[PDB]
Design a protein around this ligand. Structure first.
Ligand code: HEM
Ligand code: HEM
Ligand SMILES: Cc1cc(N)nc(CCCCCO[C@H]2CNC[C@H]2Cc2cc(C)cc(N)n2)c1
Ligand SMILES: Cc1cc(N)nc(CCCCCO[C@H]2CNC[C@H]2Cc2cc(C)cc(N)n2)c1
Ligand SMILES: C[C@H](O)[C@H](O)[C@H]1CNc2nc(N)[nH]c(=O)c2N1
Ligand SMILES: C[C@H](O)[C@H](O)[C@H]1CNc2nc(N)[nH]c(=O)c2N1
Ligand SMILES: [Cl-]
Ligand SMILES: [Cl-]
Lengths: 362, 362
């Protein structure tokens, strides 16, 4: 019955994919080959063109993503050939280097061998390839609480963090056959970080905030035509609010708004003063400014929404249904100033797509 | 079959209502009386206690409302006795006066006779009892575009607006039996308005913004135990963002952000400057400040969310399911700074409730 589900997802995908590629004539023959490949082997192997287009369709179908206008320029790196932990480590280091591109960030995905029988070939433990550690013990809170459990798991494996608020977590992943993952410290030369300064409030530097340049999500599953690529890390550039309104601002993350309020010189005493809102705006201006100043790609939420409107228009012109999750598409800063807020979106799940999967730790 | 639906909604309501009122023993007898009243007459009449508690339950069940903590202190005025247009007009003037309460606003609802056979007894045309007119002709845009169609309908009836950006619309309503509604100009003595000034930017006054004190929604239907009170205007006090982030800010409403940006002295040239966001925060500070300074009730969105959290806790403690519409509960300014943003809500519709109904104009 496994062959059955797989075959159905493959027909649907190849038909859709080849139609978009203008290769509609080649479908019947490609599907034949697939059909006997599934029979003989229990699975099938994507061509480089299918895998590339699939990863691109999956981004286009990600309901939560405002950045989708650029789906068709995704840089797909095919690493289905890897067999050893050194190869994975080097594929992961290369992805960081090439996606970063000296600050001019290239949306990239590196695709590792897929699941075989539900059996993972490579299992990445990181939530993002570049992320800060978090520690919580004896009342003390250091670093990013979102990382606290993975940080504790790395420290079970003989890694030790310096316990700054910005320790980079090592890459950590497990190969099939191994009972424990291995970890490798990131070469600092590969990792761009941006110190947060404000364009006109000189004291803002006193907070000593920084963030890393590239969000490289490494814990989702790419599903393309029934094939499950559980290890396929991908990146874009940040939208400023992700850093300024959530990572640095959330009470359960870095929780910096009171400190922001103090350095910009406003009281943080009365809700009616809207000091959180004012602090949020200044922190978000700082973030955009700082990335720009350092020559690292970033997009503000107004420009991002204006790009997403073009994505909507493009979908319509192409005859494609648009899907989206309004609750994640709206930015957390001035959402009613974007067109997104004032319309609704069909939150249907269309495949190919990226999916959440269970963490091997916790 | 009409008796059938009505009877079912009545059983459900009386049982629930009397249980909450600790009058559970009186249900069987009250339901008997109702049953024969529906038989004889085709309907039934609520007791003053049922009608009051029903209006209060309806507020408690309004999924879109963040202000619900205070549901049980709603002031219910029973005006089911009205039969003439002078009586309706005076009930409506009284509601404005008593709800305003010299600025210390009292959440109030005035309940008019309900629909009889689907036939309305009184049909209110206003969306709110106090609202500004809107005009759009020959490229010119004056006043509130949200009012443009009702404004045009009033002007068909011999009313003429002065064409300021803040003309008060007359009360306009139709009595059953009349083919046309009547209109009555609001006595300005009854209507509190608040000029918008900023606590520390003196030039803000140059915009000459103002807004009215009390939002009195007059176009929804109150449904209680199968009875349809299509005319039952109700009010609370504003949450500042309704005025500052939407009525004064939306491009399709007063559209004031560019003007705000100019008077607070920031450029409105680059999305990455976050000038809309900064303008929004300053406009919203001004609004809160101005209401407070004038002694008119208002609540900021942080305090409102903190009150709503208590409503959630109270619902849990009482064993009541909570319902809510996340998409309307989040404020349009810094939504991620409220707890509302970080949880989900069941958007089920529970009765008694307030419902949208079709406008008689347009
Ligand atoms: C090019 C710049 C990009 C920007 C500015 C962008 C922006 C965003 C934002 C703001 C979110 C919401 C995240 C949150 O609030 O937690 C998001 C979610 C997402 N984006 Fe994009 N994105 C970009 C590129 C990409 C790429 C290249 C892919 C995949 C190939 C992708 C797939 C997704 C997915 C799957 C989610 C949902 C993640 C989850 O469920 O946790 N995005 N994006
Ligand atoms: C006491 C102060 C109150 C505050 C601060 C408050 C706040 C709000 C807010 C902010 C909204 C969203 C409006 C929008 O974005 O369009 C809303 C919706 C609503 N409120 Fe309240 N509210 C209050 C009192 C009341 C009262 C007294 C009732 C009824 C008895 C009520 C019933 C509703 C209803 C029915 C809606 C949805 C209206 C619609 O569907 O268009 N509220 N409230
Ligand atoms: C590629 C990319 C570019 C860009 N600018 N931004 C992103 C953001 C992806 C989200 C990253 C953080 O997501 C974490 C924190 N919020 C949700 C959590 C991920 C998650 C968790 C769970 C339980 C489910 C789910 N679908 N996704 C991705
Ligand atoms: C009582 C009260 C207090 C307070 N602070 N705020 C309110 C706000 C009620 C909403 C007033 C404005 O609503 C208008 C503009 N947005 C939605 C529209 C009303 C509406 C329209 C439609 C088509 C459906 C619907 N359910 N409601 C009500
Ligand atoms: C965290 C919680 O699930 C909440 O409902 C959602 C909704 N809105 C969001 N929107 C974005 N872009 N990112 C998020 O993490 C969340 N959180
Ligand atoms: C206007 C459009 O329907 C949009 O989806 C909604 C969602 N969020 C909202 N939230 C509130 N409080 N008020 C509104 O008018 C809207 N608009
Ligand atoms: Cl992030
Ligand atoms: Cl309003």
């Amino acid at each position: 019955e496994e062959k059955e589900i797989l075959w159905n997802e493959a027909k649907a995908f190849i038909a859709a994919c080849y139609q978009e590629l203008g290769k509609a004539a080649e479908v019947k023959d490609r599907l034949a080959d697939i059909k006997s490949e599934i029979d003989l082997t229990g699975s099938y192997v994507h061509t480089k063109e299918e895998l590339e287009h699939g990863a691109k369709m999956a981004w286009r179908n990600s309901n939560r993503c405002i950045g989708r206008l650029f789906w068709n320029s995704l840089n797909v790196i095919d690493r289905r050939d890897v067999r050893t932990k050194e190869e994975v480590r080097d594929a992961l280091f290369h992805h960081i280097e090439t996606a970063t591109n000296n600050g001019k960030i290239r949306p990239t995905i590196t695709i590792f061998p897929p699941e075989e029988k539900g059996e993972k070939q490579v299992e990445i433990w990181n939530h993002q390839l570049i992320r800060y550690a978090g520690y919580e013990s004896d009342g003390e809170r250091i670093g990013d609480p979102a990382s606290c459990s993975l940080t504790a798991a790395c420290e079970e494996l003989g890694w030790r963090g310096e316990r700054t608020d910005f320790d980079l977590l090592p890459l950590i992943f497990r190969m099939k056959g191994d009972e424990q993952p291995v970890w490798y410290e990131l070469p600092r030369s590969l990792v761009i970080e941006v110190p947060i300064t404000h364009p006109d409030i000189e004291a803002f530097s006193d907070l000593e905030l920084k963030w890393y340049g590239v969000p490289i999500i490494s814990d989702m599953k790419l599903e393309v035509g029934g094939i499950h690529y559980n290890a396929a890390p991908f990146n874009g550039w940040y939208m400023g609010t992700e850093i300024g309104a959530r990572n640095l601002a959330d009470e359960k993350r870095y929780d910096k708004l009171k400190k922001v309020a103090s350095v910009i010189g406003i009281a943080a005493d009365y809700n009616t003063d809207l000091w959180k809102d004012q602090a949020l705006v200044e922190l978000n201006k700082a973030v955009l400014h700082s990335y720009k100043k350092q020559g690292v790609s970033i997009v503000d939420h107004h420009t991002a929404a204006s790009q997403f409107k073009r994505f909507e228009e493009q979908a319509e012109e192409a005859g494609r249904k648009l899907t989206g999750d309004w609750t994640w598409l709206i930015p957390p800063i001035s959402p009613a100033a974007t067109h997104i807020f004032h319309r609704s979106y069909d939150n249907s799940i269309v495949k190919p797509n990226y999916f959440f999967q269970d963490k091997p730790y916790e």
